Amino acid sequence: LRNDVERLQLSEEEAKVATGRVLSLQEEIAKLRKDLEQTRSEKKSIEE
Amino acid sequence: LRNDVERLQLSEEEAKVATGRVLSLQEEIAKLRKDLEQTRSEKKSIEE
């Protein structure tokens, strides 16, 4: 049981790290989405 | 020790969920970057 506890703590550390990276990449995705929408609007306006 | 194992196994499940999420977010980052690049190129060509 102690060995299992140690291994799973070693796992939870990576759990927290991965959660933080997920949050960061989600924010980056949101920023990229707004940038893409703005570029699409510019392209459309140039079209008209 | 059993309580610790159960809690840390839940955290390990969170680790797996975060790994899947980070992979999906990386894929969406690539997709957004590609869409932005093509939209920029199209708008530049239309403007020219």
With an 8 Å Cβ cutoff, is B31 touching chain A?
Answer: no
A4 contacts on B by Cβ (under 8 Å): 1, 5
**C-beta atoms of A5 and B9 within 8 A:** no
**C-beta atoms of A22 and B26 within 8 A:** no
- What is residue B1's DSSP assignment? -
- Taking each helix axis from N to C end, the angle separating B2-47 and A2-47, rounded to the nearest 10 degrees, works out to 20
Instruction: Give long-range contacts, CB 8 A cutoff, 24+ apart: B25-28.
Output: B25/A22, B25/A25, B25/A26, B25/A28, B25/A29, B26/A25, B28/A29
User: For this experimental structure, what is the resolution in angstroms?
Assistant: 4.8
**C-beta atoms of B5 and A8 within 8 A:** yes
The experimental method behind these coordinates is: cryo-EM
